[PDB]
Ligand binder design. Structure first.
Ligand SMILES: [Zn+2]
Ligand SMILES: [Zn+2]
Length: 76
């Protein structure tokens, strides 16, 4: 089943390569260019409003639909 919408366990993949982004996630020598695009966690992309790491599929359509466009953190 798929419920929760959050981080999930991780298996021990084989015959693959680590991510250059320095993230604890390996894909392979083919899905590499498809992981650092919008499939990488440490892709290094934080919102300018809500300031919350996001993917490429979100950071894109999230630029206009941000949960914290104004309201921000208490101290910071
Ligand atoms: Zn990665
Ligand atoms: Zn945002």
């Amino acid at each position: 089943g798929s419920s929760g919408s959050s981080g999930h366990l991780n298996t021990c993949s084989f015959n693959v390569i680590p991510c250059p982004n320095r993230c604890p996630m390996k894909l392979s020598r083919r899905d590499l260019p498809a992981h650092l695009q919008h499939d990488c966690p440490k892709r290094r992309l934080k919102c300018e409003f809500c300031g919350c790491d996001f993917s490429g599929e979100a950071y894109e359509s999230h630029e206009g639909m941000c949960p914290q466009e104004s309201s921000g953190p208490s101290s910071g």
